[PDB]
Amino acid sequence: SVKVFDTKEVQDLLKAAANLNGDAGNARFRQIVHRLLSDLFKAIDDLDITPDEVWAGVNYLNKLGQDGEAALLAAGIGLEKYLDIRMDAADRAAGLDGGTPRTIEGPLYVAGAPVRDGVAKIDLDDDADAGPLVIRGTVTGTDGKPLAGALVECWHANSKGFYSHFDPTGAQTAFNLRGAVRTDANGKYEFRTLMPVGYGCPPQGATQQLLNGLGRHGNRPAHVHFFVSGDGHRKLTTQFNIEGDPLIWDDFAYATREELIPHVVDKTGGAALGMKSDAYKEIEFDIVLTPLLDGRDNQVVHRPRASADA
Amino acid sequence: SVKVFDTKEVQDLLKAAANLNGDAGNARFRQIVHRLLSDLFKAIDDLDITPDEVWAGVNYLNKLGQDGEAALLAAGIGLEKYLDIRMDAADRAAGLDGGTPRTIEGPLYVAGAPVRDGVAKIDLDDDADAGPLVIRGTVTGTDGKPLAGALVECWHANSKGFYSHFDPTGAQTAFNLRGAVRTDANGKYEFRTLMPVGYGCPPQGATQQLLNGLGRHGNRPAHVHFFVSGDGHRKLTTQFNIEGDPLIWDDFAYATREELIPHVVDKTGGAALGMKSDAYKEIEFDIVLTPLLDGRDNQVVHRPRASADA
Ligand SMILES: [Zn+2]
Ligand SMILES: [Zn+2]
């Protein structure tokens, strides 16, 4: 067995490849690339990764991008959760850890949903196998005061586990099961929707291929995603899990938090809300936002996101 | 900046994501994934890589695979050269460092070229801007005796810097500038071709995008690729560079070696050889192969490769 990482030839190659001694340029980017390349080269050296293994990994990266799944893989190997862990640690160090917990966004947000006042009905497509669901709650700040005019956005899957704009069967209308509500004067919001079923990775796709190699499933428990925002407060990325889903603590993207599992309550009187049956389920999901730090939101995330027109 | 990498929560997440403790999955694959993931998480912690930075990297991985350029990036950030450095070290440790030096294959080999005995004309398409070139040499073993019936394959670019089967203009015939010759009884091979000009990355592609961010060019000096094989000997991947190219020691893929820069000789008498002018250039490139180690070729590489019919 041979080791070459700590040799002058290898260190010169890394310096050249990242252009550390180049003209003035993007020093931060060169610093990051040098670190990632150095770590990769050292891992190849330490584990004696063969050329055949490396070229299989290179081939995998081609498939990953061809499938458009790099952000799904980021969820599946815990990187997305890891970013939340680092934001959580920064919040604890600054006393901003008293609100509704964050969790991962996932890769399926779509911008452009219509904003309603107080109540939105977001099931645009018929879904016979999904029962009616009312999600409602109150938004407050950590101080305790309800927040009027706060913007509550949600998105979730249908009974086949698919999201609109990402449904491979093409069966969904634009913005089905996606919507936004401005809270009323008492901080209240309400979504009228249908019950989600859990998501699973595209079985032929790159993420599931890698999970298969690891001996891992690619499934998520049923859940609903949220963005919540409002004047004077930081933007919350969160979700809640559907109580009783047996995958709730075995999510392939590691998103579950014990504070984010509200009760599912059987109700009647559905016709008064325009639901499709008298019997329906209600989930009360109250949300607590944190104030800005020095007038700034130190944890909002910019990433590529889909958009569409109504 | 927070430091969370060493915490139990993060170490547990890494063990889960790579399924180190599961019964299922490929053991070697889980080990490699855990190492790469652990190193990535530590780098993010150490350099305080922001979520915005991480998601830009994720987006880049999508573009890289969409462009089909993972193998081109592997050459461009020195990973392909690095594999050669590790193979060279193994050969030194085993006493097998006495042949013509290896260099990188690159991503543009195509299997299927018609095999000729002794001499092959490989410029099938006219190319007015490239002058005539003869490449000839003798294949020997490390003992200095000629190897008869050894297979010498070469491939190189036209005057526009493009290879057949990878020419985005579609202008080249199958196997243009791609040869395969079996050496004669005296070990000799000869190719009659045109002079290559250097390759450059697809300018809108992912590899050049990353190089642009580093402040690096994506150009190669003019060169000719070789595979050389023969019974009882290991398969050699190598190249030679055209003497005098201004980029000869500034290859973006770091492939140049001092032993692989043969002298270019001005000749006359081209018409008798079937060349398009009386004056032509000649390059003598002798090749030394190494015998098998314990009956096996311990350095042959299996990677995805194109193929075509003549
Ligand atoms: Zn989801
Ligand atoms: Zn080349």
Side-chain angles (χ1 to χ4, degrees), chain A residues 2 16-17 19 28 30 35 41 45-48 52-53 55 62 65-66 70 82 86 213-214 216 302, chain B residues 2 17 19 26 28 35 41 45-48 52-53 55 62 65-66 70 82 86 214 216 254 302-303:
Chain A
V2 296
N19 201 29
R28 172 65 169 178
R30 297 176 185 177
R35 173 58 175 271
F41 285 19
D45 203 46
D46 284 346
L47 285 57
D48 204 15
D52 288 13
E53 291 174 317
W55 291 119
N62 278 326
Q66 277 142 33
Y82 182 60
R86 297 195 81 252
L214 298 171
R216 287 181 55 211
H302 179 60
Chain B
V2 301
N19 200 27
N26 180 285
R28 167 67 165 178
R35 174 57 179 267
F41 285 20
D45 207 43
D46 276 353
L47 282 48
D48 196 19
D52 288 9
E53 286 170 329
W55 292 116
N62 277 327
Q66 277 139 33
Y82 183 63
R86 302 199 74 258
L214 298 171
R216 292 180 51 208
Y254 305 111
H302 307 351
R303 60 187 283 186

Side-chain angles (χ1 to χ4, degrees), chain A residues 19 26 36 43 57 101 112 140 153 183 185 189 200 219 243 274 280 301:
Chain A
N19 201 29
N26 194 324
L36 294 176
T140 57
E153 312 174 40
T183 60
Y189 76 93
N219 299 314
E243 170 181 75
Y280 69 103
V301 173

